[PDB]
């Protein structure tokens, strides 16, 4: 009664299995015999007294890989050919028949032998869909820069698809800020939704694939590496609120059009502000009359023509 | 101190090659070039030199035994399709890059390389054609030098570039073809980060296994049961059905059933372990 | 000799240590942890600039040459192509 077969004969219960060839893992401690019996068993300890140069680094790694590869062949050799195929599967070089179901009828009808049919296996990560945020640059030979939220056909792994990427910067490693276009001649952080992939997986982007719209221009639009995988992103955009001064008293001044109601001011009481000239200031309090007007103090006197800005995201 | 430098240039990133120790699959050779550059006539010329037989028409992958222990599969890339260019670059172990010498470089010749440059080097060989169109030897040799030094730009300096003058009876110069054929044999291939960790294969033949009765009682709109045949590459494919796999330009379909068939074009080196004969085509 | 007689050293890029640095084009942003292939000793090397740092990525081959005290080494070739050539967009790095 070899247990190699019995282990995978699910019809036989595990308790039935053990006895023939002779409870729960949630209990970490394994089962032990009764205490007094163990003591008598272990009055004598004799039963277990028995238990107690390569020239370069590079070839050592090569040696380790080869030595590991040699191990697989040795065991694969002795394994029965059926047992091998069960474990290793079909090895490369094997001529195999693959049967598929639920294929579109168009593939059968619109079949041209000239166009190749390539089949590529997928690891678990390729099945997952989520946000792929990556380092991307406009290709040097491409005429125009890419735009955010602009469709782009991307070549990832075995799969090609069209997606709407968003191009971002780290802003001195402080936040993920959205860009309108690619940098002219450098990489930028690019976020898009699609099938996930392992890091270190490179890709290309193309904006047009049809022959009709090919034109005379070079087509490979963008190049990059998947640097990140996640299923959210927190891309943010700078939103600047603009108000105007109408009454200025040395450092103190009153501003209008920044907000619509005093309630809006109240939420932003305590908020930092500055002018176009760069004079930093502060929202002190909301003026009762008229609505939306608030008092602000600046490090120096501002002028009527000065425009005050509140930086937000 | 040259020895230290020579001892240095041999050191590289320690990789693992998953190529089987026995019975490796035929290498995928991609014949890529602009339309009309001579892709079809090139394939016909090589296959004749390898197996001494001429194929009037070529469609889909063509597998031959090019060596005692080496086998090749020749694929013609549709020059007018960019999508076809991309996926072949993901699997083409070797590329035969066709360039029209009289015209010079063309965009797709650059773009195929560029797609290759981002998806991992296969071996790439430059083949220059239509050189007979040149009328003067001076302009010819100058064009060759300019063409060659550029091919050293995209591809490592000193990369081989083969030259073909004209086509006779639908065949290139036999002596030149023989030189290319030997070159295809001495090339030693490389481990690639994408190829060695996903299982892939190129379909040599396509078959629909749907019952004709089903096609009629439900209609042609019904989904179809399809069988695909060919040689596996890269990592071994697990035997159990249900594996998740992708077909380019079609979608992701789970294998319903799989089985290993005898090699239609077995290598002689395997057989003698168990010559004009030894060269086979399937 | 720093390289035991060689003029250049091949290395394995392990980590871009200064990647988190807030100040752009800082000296620390330009350092990368590289392990020498010939012996396995871990070493730090400079990158010419932050823009060039985009090209170097983990587990790629790098060629080192003599040059935050202590960093003696500058990357001169990555993945078989000169960094300056990539910086000048005269080339692409092969993968």
């Amino acid at each position: 009664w070899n247990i190699g077969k019995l282990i995978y004969m699910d019809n036989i219960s595990p308790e039935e299995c053990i006895r023939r060839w002779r409870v729960d893992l949630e209990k970490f401690v394994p089962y032990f015999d009764t205490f007094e019996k163990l003591a008598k068993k272990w009055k004598s300890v004799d039963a277990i007294k028995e238990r107690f140069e390569y020239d370069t680094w590079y070839e050592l790694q090569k040696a380790k890989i080869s030595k590991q590869l040699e191990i697989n062949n040795i065991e694969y050799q002795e394994m029965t050919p059926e047992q091998r195929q069960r474990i290793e599967g079909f090895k490369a070089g094997s001529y195999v028949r693959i049967v598929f179901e639920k294929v579109p009828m168009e593939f059968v009808k619109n079949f041209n032998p000239k166009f190749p049919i390539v089949m590529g296996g997928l690891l678990p990560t390729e099945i997952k869909f989520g946000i792929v945020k990556a380092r991307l640059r406009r290709h040097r030979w491409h005429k125009k820069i890419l735009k955010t939220n602009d469709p782009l056909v991307l070549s990832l792994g075995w799969r090609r698809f069209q997606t709407l990427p968003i191009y971002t910067t780290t802003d001195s490693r402080t936040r993920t800020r959205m860009l309108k276009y690619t940098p002219e001649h450098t990489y930028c952080n690019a976020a898009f939704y699609g099938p996930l992939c392992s890091p270190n997986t490179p890709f290309c982007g193309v904006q047009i694939v049809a022959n009709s719209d090919t034109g005379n221009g070079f087509r490979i639009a963008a190049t990059g590496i998947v640097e990140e995988i996640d299923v959210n992103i927190e891309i943010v955009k700078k939103l600047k609120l603009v108000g105007f001064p109408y009454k200025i008293f040395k450092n103190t001044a009153f501003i209008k059009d920044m907000f619509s109601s005093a309630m809006e001011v109240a939420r932003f009481e305590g908020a930092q502000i500055k002018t176009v000239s760069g004079i930093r200031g502060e929202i002190k309090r909301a003026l009762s009359k008229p609505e939306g007007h608030y008092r602000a103090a600046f490090e120096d006197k501002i002028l009527m023509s000065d425009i005050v800005i509140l930086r937000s995201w | 101190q040259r020895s230290s430098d020579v001892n240095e240039r041999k050191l590289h990133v320690p990789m693992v090659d998953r190529t089987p120790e026995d019975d490796p699959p035929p290498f995928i050779v991609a014949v890529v070039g602009p339309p009309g550059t001579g892709k079809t006539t090139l394939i016909r010329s090589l296959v004749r030199r390898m197996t001494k037989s001429t194929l009037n028409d070529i469609q889909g992958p063509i597998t031959v035994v090019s060596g005692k222990h080496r086998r090749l599969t020749f694929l013609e890339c549709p020059a007018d399709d960019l999508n076809a260019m991309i996926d072949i670059a993901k699997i083409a172990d070797l590329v035969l890059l066709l360039i029209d010498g009289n015209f010079g470089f063309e965009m797709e010749t650059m773009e195929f390389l560029n797609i290759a440059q981002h998806h991992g080097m296969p071996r790439v060989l430059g083949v220059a054609t239509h050189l007979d169109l040149f009328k003067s030897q001076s302009t010819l040799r100058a064009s060759k030098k300019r063409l060659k030094h550029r091919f050293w730009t995209e591809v490592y300096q000193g990369a081989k570039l083969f030259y073909l003058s004209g086509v006779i009876n639908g065949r290139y110069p036999d002596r030149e073809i023989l030189n290319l054929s030997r070159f295809i044999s001495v090339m030693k291939f490389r481990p690639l980060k994408w190829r060695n960790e996903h299982p892939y294969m190129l379909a040599d033949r396509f078959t629909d296994l749907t019952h004709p009765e089903l096609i009629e009682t439900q209609g042609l709109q019904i989904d179809r049961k399809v069988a695909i045949y060919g040689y596996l590459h890269g990592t071994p494919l697990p035997s159990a059905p249900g594996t998740r796999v992708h077909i380019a330009g079609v979608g992701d379909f789970s294998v319903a059933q799989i089985e290993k068939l005898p090699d239609p074009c077995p290598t002689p080196f395997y057989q003698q372990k168990l010559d004009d004969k030894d060269k086979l085509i399937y | 000799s720093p390289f035991g007689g060689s003029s250049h050293a091949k290395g394995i890029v392990l980590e871009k240590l200064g990647i988190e640095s807030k100040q752009p084009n800082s000296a620390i942003r330009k350092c990368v942890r590289v392990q020498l292939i010939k012996n396995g000793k871990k070493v730090t090397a400079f990158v010419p600039n932050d823009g060039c740092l985009n090209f170097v990525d983990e587990n790629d081959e790098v060629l080192l040459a003599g040059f935050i005290p202590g960093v003696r080494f500058k990357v001169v070739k990555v993945s078989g192509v000169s960094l300056l050539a990539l910086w000048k967009e005269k080339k692409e790095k092969p993968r």
Binding site: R140, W141, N216 | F103, G104, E106 | E89, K90
Partner: peptide, 25 residues
């Protein structure tokens, strides 16, 4: 139908600083 490569492709000059004409001779 045939779309010859442009000058930027032809020389691969890339990004270079502007240089004075006098250097040419």
């Amino acid at each position: 139908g045939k779309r010859a490569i442009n000058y930027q492709i032809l020389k691969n000059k890339g990004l270079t600083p502007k240089r004075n004409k006098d250097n040419r001779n």
